[PDB]
Amino acid sequence: MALYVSPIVSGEVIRSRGGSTSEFTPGYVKPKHEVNPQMTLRRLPDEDP
Amino acid sequence: YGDVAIVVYSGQYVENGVKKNFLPDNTMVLGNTQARGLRTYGCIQDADA
């Protein structure tokens, strides 16, 4: 804060401030999915008969 | 042979390494020259196709 150093002593020296780092590197996602080429033979729920 | 013709069919098909006759030893088929038959074909269930 400041507290009260008297005008007869030098006083203490404050450490200024600062210093904080961090890392958040990798991440990933990959939704592979199949087309199923033999699924197209039968009738889909759509595509009215 | 009268109203009917005589055709001797000695066709052969190859197995893995040997020959075999299309017809059995002793059979005959009463047929018609205009008898309609289907040479129908399926669908190619290939991904590239």
Side-chain angles (χ1 to χ4, degrees):
Chain A
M1 174 178 216
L3 295 174
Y4 273 140
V5 175
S6 163
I8 315 170
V9 291
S10 66
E12 191 216 350
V13 176
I14 319 295
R15 264 68 165 162
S16 84
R17 292 179 292 173
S20 81
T21 52
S22 62
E23 59 284 340
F24 307 94
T25 43
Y28 212 77
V29 55
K30 44 196 309 188
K32 185 197 291 184
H33 161 245
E34 168 60 28
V35 74
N36 189 359
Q38 310 162 349
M39 186 142 180
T40 57
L41 291 179
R42 175 42 181 190
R43 189 185 72 85
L44 300 166
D46 305 343
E47 302 214 287
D48 48 352
Chain B
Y1 195 53
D3 186 2
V4 290
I6 319 296
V7 176
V8 179
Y9 166 60
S10 75
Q12 287 181 355
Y13 82 111
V14 288
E15 265 293 350
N16 48 325
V18 297
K19 306 278 188 63
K20 289 197 181 56
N21 276 37
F22 268 112
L23 286 160
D25 63 358
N26 298 118
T27 45
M28 61 165 58
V29 288
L30 277 296
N32 180 292
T33 182
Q34 287 331 289
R36 55 172 293 168
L38 276 298
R39 199 132 62 87
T40 192
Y41 274 118
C43 52
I44 305 302
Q45 53 192 8
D46 181 285
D48 291 331

